[PDB]
Design a binder for this molecule. Structure first.
Ligand SMILES: CCCCCCCCCCCCCCCCCC(=O)OC[C@H](COP(=O)([O-])OCC(O)COP(=O)([O-])OC[C@@H](COC(=O)CCCCCCCCCCCCCCCCC)OC(=O)CCCCCCCCCCCCCCCCC)OC(=O)CCCCCCCCCCCCCCCCC
Ligand SMILES: CCCCCCCCCCCCCCCCCC(=O)OC[C@H](COP(=O)([O-])OCC(O)COP(=O)([O-])OC[C@@H](COC(=O)CCCCCCCCCCCCCCCCC)OC(=O)CCCCCCCCCCCCCCCCC)OC(=O)CCCCCCCCCCCCCCCCC
Ligand SMILES: CCCCCCCCCCCCCCCCCC(=O)OC[C@H](COP(=O)([O-])OCC[N+](C)(C)C)OC(=O)CCCCCCCCCCCCCCCCC
Ligand SMILES: CCCCCCCCCCCC(=O)SCCNC(=O)CCNC(=O)[C@H](O)C(C)(C)COP(=O)(O)O
Ligand code: SF4
Ligand code: SF4
Ligand code: SF4
Lengths: 198, 57, 189, 56, 109, 191, 218, 44, 161, 172
């Protein structure tokens, strides 16, 4: 950590009604900072990021989600401290995280948003960051997040005429149906799934 | 290797092209689908008449 | 390897044919190096966390890599002669796909696509984001003032050429150039 | 089958039992190698490298 | 580092396992990259608190291997560090002592 | 035909090979190893490459250091050369496979100090036997005529059906009397 | 972890002639003519020079009136590159370079006495990333810990090598054989019979490679 | 530093005049020489 | 009898179709690169007279080289059906053979043989370039022999009936 | 309107006209439009089950208006009549009619529109997409059905029918 680093406190100085929860770790890069952002302010915060002076040169590197409902500390349970970020995973249905890179500040900024509503509603930002379109499409299809005000909600990387969210911990890697060829129908069909257990 | 040191490769490919089966798409026009290549072959094999191999050969 | 395949496929799509064979010969040599170090010419599965197969690493492998590096200039020049200055190639690529930094920024463009805009963004030469011996090697990264396919092709060629310099520096970092010199004769022992 | 730390007689007996005839089973050689640590067999490639030819 | 004390546990000389692996590796890479006595002395003085006898001997080996000329910067900055470390050496520093002495002799300082 | 071209037969190598090996062998070398016309018998013209060795299937292996490319030093000459596209790479025995692949510079030597172990349980090399009756048949597969034994054994590993009495049997009231099938001996009852 | 630096700039190497490591031929006047072309706005952007010269006219005339592509490139490639020896390897009669680390076809080895080296520890089964190995073991009548069923699904297995790496007794080895083409999908369901047969056939070369691999650490 | 001249890392520095002359061009391209030659020759 | 003429003509037809064996330009995954490596100079495919054609109508071999996904299986079936007869199918790679590394996946078909009849299988992940060359040459030999595998019986005059 | 469903996305009736010399019109409701769908914006949020129900009814109306074209292009008219397909999809919706979450309903409607567009554009296969249109308990109209089970188990409880049928292979 022998570098010059400054917290991205501009967001919370401007959005004066929000509380700040920020982290930095040596597990990340020296210039990488994590923060907690509420969903109802996520869209406005991205609006501010996309056009603030020092945050103008910001690109949305990555976006995804975590099914925190089934998250459990498998080892060193007692070592957990109240300041750790893992404390926000427990009992929360979903956690959608975005990661941006800023060139002026040579920094990486990750924002975590907790989704507790059962339908997983959150405002999309693909209208602010263009590359977020396919990222949010993938996230919605794989985890079932209901993005709102999204440019294109059509599936991306999922099969035709199928509805599912495979990346949820409830889903099984083997799937629920297999595609074979039917001679009677003289074409590919899909039927129930029987697999091999090692 | 098609013929010792590849001496009959063109013969092999011509015979294979003869052997390969053909099917006309149902939506396509059966008459024209075959008529056009026939006319093209006739024209191509008429090409050689317009060739000279000497002062008046 | 990646730049050779990308440039070869790009040339094949545009129409040039023999570039694929010329690039894939060098790809075969590099795959031979892969197989020699890990036994798989593709999908090496070599790097693993906090462990290294030191036995596989051999000096003769380094010497063969040096020979490949010396001969790679010939393949680069062969491709460069038929692609770089060709009028058809210039008319096919120049001013096609042109984009600004803002597009580079808006769509999260990175690597060659980003550097073709002049963003000057390389993660290997970053103070807080370097991950290997790169930060302590004196090599050069290239960017273009035109964000078009021609600039991207030139950047890929230059990066292929500069990988040779980086490999040479890396191999020199593990080389014993000097030797004991006799006091009486002032010659190597 | 057996390590040199074993008796030469035991080594020879095991080799004979497994029907090995392409290995040095000499009792004296085994005794000399008994409890001895040494590097693997090496050969020499002699320069210049040239192709073997049948000129006559 | 934060809340870090670099005083050797032996109370004689620092050891590689006391430092974090990242610091040791990065300082070694910097020493290897140094191509002049001036820059090598700058690096060594800047990171003296993390410097180890192994890395000092390796720096001497690098200078000898690349035939980096010995000059005023060496004799004025590097030499005191070598004197201090060699004085603090002991039986277990035989490798570092032999390496440093041999490479200094070969460089013919 | 023309296993040996005119320009190759006009060289000393062809005449020496004809004198020693014979016309049939010298002419069929090209058929056995159809490679570049100038490589028939080796790249050099003053003589033909000496035979490195021969394997159990009659194949002859050669090594020439004057080939124009590095990856052509070592080559094979197959015993079976009935037609082109006939002999395949699977015909190389285990010992010579590595030598051809350049894994090591040692080659099998018959009747001499060898670099390869010769255990008593070793089996002779076999080419690819797929598309042949002597192909790998999984136990219990439909092709395997003894699939019933394997299937019954697999079923019994988890659940062995009870062998019910068949045919006429002794009856004691409403009970069928059958001797116990347990291999174990009832020592307490016996003594 | 990180280090502290005082002089960010890496100064250029000494240019004095007397100093060692001086290269008198590093710069070539004929070649290093960059300065002439360096000041050209066309290189830096879409703009054009204030004053165009007849040199551009001559260059454009040469490029357009006399199209040099069909001659320059035709010669340089067709006529010259055709003079190089072919790079082809005659596969049926020659094989490409391999290494003792090559992972080809799986096989099961034996001790020189003929006993199986495989003890049913299932380390290979657990390490197999693709779940391609199935092992069932029962005590042998003599009492040995030996497997009763050892199957490798060659169609489901990625030839990574994890099986031989995790094997503690070098029982399962991915020998060099790669010409294992099969016409029936069932022929790729390798069983213990198939693996033991492969080991018996390929033991010489496998043992030869293992010798070098074991000796390398020494 | 290898990217700059006279670096200690460079090794091929002594008596490279002949080798460099053989390996690299000894000529410079005049901008319009080929154009003028070809056009005048074509006209005549 | 027709056999007098059929048998030599059968041999000629088999030789011609073996010499000219054009696969389809179709690659799905990393196995594609291996196919390209076989096509390129180090292991020239052209030596054995195999040249790739883009359209299925002009293809004799279907190289299933790469993983097959449920989203693609109908496409593979359509391509196979649209390829002009006679034709053969060669599966390449573990993924094409039996699902490979993704046999326990929810998207990948457990084998291209479920959608298509696979004439030959080439194990590997990826199969070596020489491995693919061996598979293709074995397929060519089998193809040449398929015309007359001794089905018809010989009568007292040695003529098949 | 710059949308796939816009009134200007119709296929022209002629090379030089739209269906007339005095008027401009085209069909885009019962067939696919002229330009492909580049973007499908998310359904505007519904704050009420009333709005959610209206969205469901409108989506079902669009599906019913499009089903004959889907059947004709996919050559599945023989398997079921247009009305039969409509009723089968109605049963599909009825099974889901218990929903009471507007956000979930909006997500479901988005998915339904996407799958409908795929069916229009032939992205899906007929055998793969007919699973939604297939009857729940009636035989397919293009096949001969077997009533052996009904004859054997006439006037018997579903439990007994399942007991006789079995639910596990008997070989192992
Ligand atoms: C007395 C006069 C007698 C005249 C007889 C004329 C008729 C027979 C001539 C045959 C010559 C070629 C050998 C054919 C038999 C091969 C057998 C074989 O390999 O079996 C395996 C063979 C398959 O294995 P393969 O390795 O793939 O076959 C190799 C190929 O044949 C490819 O390899 P290849 O070797 O077969 O092809 C060679 C050919 C390559 O040709 C080509 O590529 C052109 C092909 C053009 C298309 C032709 C289509 C023909 C279709 C025929 C269909 C069957 C007809 C059957 C009719 C039966 C009638 C009873 O060119 C040559 O090399 C010509 C050889 C003759 C040159 C003259 C020799 C002397 C020169 C020096 C003189 C001075 C010496 C001074 C010495 C002084 C010493 C002191 O299976 C068969 O049995 C099929 C055989 C098919 C043969 C095709 C022949 C094509 C060329 C025919 C014309 C050649 C010119 C004749 C001129 C005659 C002028 C009078
Ligand atoms: C019957 C059997 C036939 C067998 C045929 C077998 C096959 C033969 C293939 C032949 C192919 C052609 C040769 C290619 C050589 C390539 C060399 C190369 O890589 O450099 C390229 C070179 C330019 O590249 P570079 O020099 O590397 O550029 C870098 C420079 O630093 C850049 O410096 P820069 O840009 O400032 O100027 C450089 C310039 C040099 O510029 C100057 O120095 C010009 C200075 C003057 C400027 C204008 C001012 C006016 C000057 C005249 C003033 C006169 C009046 C003075 C009045 C004074 C009053 C006081 O360089 C040039 O010369 C470029 C001009 C390109 C000419 C194109 C030649 C086409 C040849 C086509 C041959 C077709 C053969 C067909 C088959 C046979 C017939 C059926 O271009 C050439 O020189 C092309 C070759 C020119 C001819 C030399 C050879 C002549 C003899 C050919 C014999 C062929 C064999 C058969 C003969 C018949 C036997 C019976
Ligand atoms: C004898 C010492 C001097 C030798 C000098 C070299 C001369 C070589 C001449 C060409 C080869 C001639 C036939 C070789 C023997 C073949 C025996 C046989 O069974 O044939 C089956 C072979 C079978 O074919 P094949 O064996 O060539 O190939 C089939 C096998 N595959 C598919 C693998 C390639 O028949 C033939 O040889 C092919 C037909 C040849 C027809 C032309 C014959 C020309 C004869 C010229 C003789 C010249 C002699 C020199 C002196 C002349 C003086 C005037
Ligand atoms: C071409 C093939 C297309 C196949 C598409 C397959 C994908 C379909 C996507 C999912 C569609 C749904 O389930 S959308 C699920 C919609 N949710 C609800 O319907 C709950 C509220 N229901 C009501 O208001 C009424 O019950 C109502 C039944 C509407 C009317 O009933 P009537 O007032 O009594
Ligand atoms: S090679 Fe890898 S995937 Fe295949 S059986 Fe061995 S360990 Fe399993
Ligand atoms: S092959 Fe090796 S790792 Fe696998 S069960 Fe046998 S002894 Fe254990
Ligand atoms: S078998 Fe292996 S190499 Fe081939 S496509 Fe599948 S993962 Fe890639």
């Amino acid at each position: 950590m022998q570098n010059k680093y400054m917290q991205p406190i501009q967001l919370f100085i401007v959005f004066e009604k929000l509380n700040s929860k920020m982290w930095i770790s040596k597990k990340l890069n020296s210039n990488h900072s994590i923060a907690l952002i509420p969903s109802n302010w996520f869209y406005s915060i991205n609006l501010f990021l996309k056009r603030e002076l020092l945050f103008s040169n910001i690109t949305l590197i990555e976006n995804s989600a975590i099914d925190t409902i089934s998250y459990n500390l498998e080892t060193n349970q007692n070592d957990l401290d109240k300041t750790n970020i893992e404390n926000y995973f427990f009992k929360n249905k979903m956690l959608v995280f975005y990661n941006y890179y800023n060139y002026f500040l040579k920094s990486k900024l990750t924002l975590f948003i907790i989704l507790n509503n059962l339908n997983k509603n959150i405002d999309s930002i693909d209208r602010i960051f263009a590359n977020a379109n396919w990222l949010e499409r993938e996230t919605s299809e794989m985890y079932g997040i209901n993005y709102k005000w999204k440019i294109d909600t059509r599936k991306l990387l999922l099969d035709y005429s199928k509805i599912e969210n495979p990346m949820l911990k409830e889903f099984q890697s083997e799937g629920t149906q297999d595609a074979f060829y039917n001679i009677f129908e003289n074409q590919v069909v899909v039927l129930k799934n029987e697999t091999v257990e090692l | 290797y098609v013929g010792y040191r590849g001496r009959l490769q063109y013969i092999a490919d011509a015979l294979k092209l003869f052997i390969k089966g053909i099917v006309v798409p149902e939506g396509s026009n059966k008459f024209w689908f075959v008529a056009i290549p026939s006319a093209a072959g006739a024209i191509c094999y008429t090409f050689w008449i317009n060739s000279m191999w000497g002062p008046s050969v | 390897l990646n730049h050779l395949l990308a440039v070869a496929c790009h040339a094949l799509d545009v129409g040039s044919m023999s570039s694929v064979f010329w690039a894939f010969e060098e790809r075969e040599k590099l795959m031979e190096f892969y197989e020699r170090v890990c036994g798989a010419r593709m999908h090496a599965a070599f790097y693993r966390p906090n462990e290294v197969n030191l036995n596989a690493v051999s000096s003769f492998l380094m010497e063969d890599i040096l020979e490949f590096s010396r001969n790679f200039f010939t393949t680069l020049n062969e491709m460069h002669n038929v692609l770089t200055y060709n009028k058809i190639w210039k008319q096919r690529l120049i001013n096609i796909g042109t984009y600004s930094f803002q597009t580079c920024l808006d769509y999260g463009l990175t690597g060659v696509m980003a550097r073709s805009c002049g963003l000057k963004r390389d993660l290997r030469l970053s103070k807080t984001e370097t991950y290997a011996n790169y930060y302590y090697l004196n090599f050069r990264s290239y960017t273009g003032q035109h964000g078009d396919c021609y600039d991207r092709f030139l950047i890929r060629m230059n990066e292929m050429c500069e990988s040779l310099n980086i490999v040479n520096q890396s191999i020199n970092k593990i080389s014993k150039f000097n030797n004991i010199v006799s006091i009486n004769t002032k010659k190597n022992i | 089958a057996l390590d040199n730390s074993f008796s030469p007689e035991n080594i020879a007996q095991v080799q004979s039992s497994i029907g090995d005839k392409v290995t040095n089973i000499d009792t004296k050689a085994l005794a000399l190698n008994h409890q001895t640590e040494e590097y693997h067999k090496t050969s020499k490639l002699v320069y210049p490298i040239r192709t073997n030819l049948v000129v006559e | 580092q934060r809340g870090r004390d670099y005083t050797p546990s032996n109370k004689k000389y620092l050891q590689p396992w006391e430092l974090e692996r990242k610091e040791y590796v990065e300082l070694s890479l910097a020493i290897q990259s140094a191509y002049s006595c001036k820059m090598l002395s700058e690096i060594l003085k800047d990171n003296l608190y993390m410097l180890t006898d192994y890395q000092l001997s390796f720096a001497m080996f690098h200078l000898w291997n690349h035939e980096i000329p010995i000059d005023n910067y060496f004799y004025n900055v590097i030499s005191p560090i070598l004197k201090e470390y060699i004085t603090r050496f002991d039986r277990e520093c035989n490798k570092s002592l032999a390496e440093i002495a041999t490479f200094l002799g070969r460089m013919n300082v | 035909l023309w296993s040996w071209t005119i320009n190759q037969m006009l060289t000393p190598k062809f005449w020496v090979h004809l004198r020693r090996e014979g016309f049939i062998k010298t002419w069929t070398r090209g058929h056995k190893a159809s490679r570049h016309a100038h490589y028939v018998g080796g790249n050099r013209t003053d003589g033909y490459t000496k035979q490195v060795g021969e394997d159990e299937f009659g194949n002859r292996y050669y090594e020439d250091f004057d080939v124009d490319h590095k990856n052509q030093r070592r080559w094979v000459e197959f015993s079976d050369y009935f037609m082109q596209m006939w002999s395949n790479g699977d015909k190389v025995p285990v010992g010579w496979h590595g030598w051809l692949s350049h894994q090591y510079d040692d080659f099998p030597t018959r009747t001499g100090n060898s670099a390869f172990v010769k255990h008593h349980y070793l089996k002779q090399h076999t080419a690819n036997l797929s598309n042949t009756p002597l192909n790998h048949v999984p136990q219990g597969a439909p092709q395997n005529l003894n699939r019933m034994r394997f299937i019954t054994a697999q079923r019994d590993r988890s659940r062995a059906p009870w062998q019910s009495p068949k045919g006429e049997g002794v009856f004691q009231g409403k009970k069928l009397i059958v001797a116990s099938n347990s291999p174990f001996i009832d020592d307490m009852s016996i003594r | 972890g990180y280090i502290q630096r005082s002089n960010i700039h890496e100064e250029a190497p000494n240019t004095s002639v007397e100093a060692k490591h001086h290269n008198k031929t590093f710069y070539d006047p004929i070649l290093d003519i960059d300065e002439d072309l360096k000041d050209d706005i066309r290189l830096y952007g879409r703009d054009k020079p204030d004053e165009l010269d007849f040199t551009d006219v001559w260059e454009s005339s040469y490029q357009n009136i006399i199209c040099p592509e069909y001659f320059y490139h035709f010669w340089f490639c067709g006529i010259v590159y055709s003079f190089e020896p072919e790079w082809t390897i005659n596969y049926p009669f020659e094989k490409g370079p391999l290494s003792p680390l090559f992972r080809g076809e799986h096989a099961l080895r034996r001790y020189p006495t003929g006993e199986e080296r495989c003890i049913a520890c299932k380390l290979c089964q657990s390490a197999c990333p693709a779940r391609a190995i199935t092992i069932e073991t029962e005590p042998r009548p003599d009492g040995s810990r030996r497997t009763v069923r050892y199957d490798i699904d060659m169609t489901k297995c990625i030839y990574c090598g994890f099986c031989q790496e995790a094997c503690p007794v070098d029982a399962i080895v991915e020998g060099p054989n790669y010409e294992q083409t099969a016409y029936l999908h069932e022929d790729l369901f390798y069983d213990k019979y198939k693996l033991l047969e492969n080991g018996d056939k390929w033991e010489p070369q496998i043992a030869r490679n293992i010798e070098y691999l074991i000796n390398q650490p020494l | 530093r290898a990217d700059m001249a006279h670096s200690p890392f460079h090794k091929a520095i002594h008596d490279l005049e002949d080798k460099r002359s053989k390996l690299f061009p000894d000529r410079r391209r005049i901008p319009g020489r080929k154009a003028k030659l070809l056009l005048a020759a074509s006209l005549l | 009898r027709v056999d007098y003429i059929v048998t030599p003509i059968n041999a000629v037809v088999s030789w011609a179709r073996q010499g000219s064996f054009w696969p389809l330009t179709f690659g799905l995954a990393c196995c594609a690169v291996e196919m390209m490596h076989a096509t390129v100079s180090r292991y020239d495919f052209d030596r054995f007279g195999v040249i790739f054609r883009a359209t299925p109508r002009q293809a004799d071999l279907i190289l299933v080289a790469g993983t097959l996904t449920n989203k693609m299986a109908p496409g593979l079936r359509r391509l196979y059906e649209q390829t002009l007869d006679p034709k053969w199918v060669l599966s390449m790679g573990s993924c094409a053979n039996g699902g490979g590394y993704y046999h326990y996946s929810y998207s990948v078909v457990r084998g291209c043989n479920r959608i298509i009849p696979v004439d030959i299988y080439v194990p590997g992940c990826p199969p070596t370039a020489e491995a693919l060359m061996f598979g293709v040459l074995q397929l060519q030999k089998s193809l040449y022999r398929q015309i007359n595998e001794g089905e018809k019986k010989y009568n007292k005059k040695d003529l098949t009936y | 309107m710059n949308h796939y469903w816009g009134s200007s996305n119709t296929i022209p009736a002629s090379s030089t006209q739209n269906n007339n010399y005095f008027s401009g019109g085209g069909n885009n409701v019962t067939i696919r439009g002229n330009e492909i769908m580049e973007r499908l914006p998310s359904q505007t949020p519904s704050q009420n089950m009333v709005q959610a129900s209206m969205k469901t009814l409108r989506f079902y109306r669009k599906f019913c208006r499009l089903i004959p074209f889907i059947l004709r292009i996919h050559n599945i008219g023989t398997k079921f009549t247009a009305q039969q397909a409509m009723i089968n999809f109605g049963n599909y919706i009825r099974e889901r009619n218990h929903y009471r979450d507007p956000g979930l309903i909006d997500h479901r409607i988005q998915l339904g529109y996407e799958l409908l567009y795929e069916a229009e554009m032939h992205f899906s296969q007929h055998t793969i997409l007919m699973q939604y249109l297939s009857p729940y308990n009636t035989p397919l109209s293009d096949r001969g059905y077997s009533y052996l089970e009904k004859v054997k188990y006439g006037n018997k409880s579903k439990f007994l029918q399942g007991f006789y049928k079995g639910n596990k292979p008997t070989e192992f």
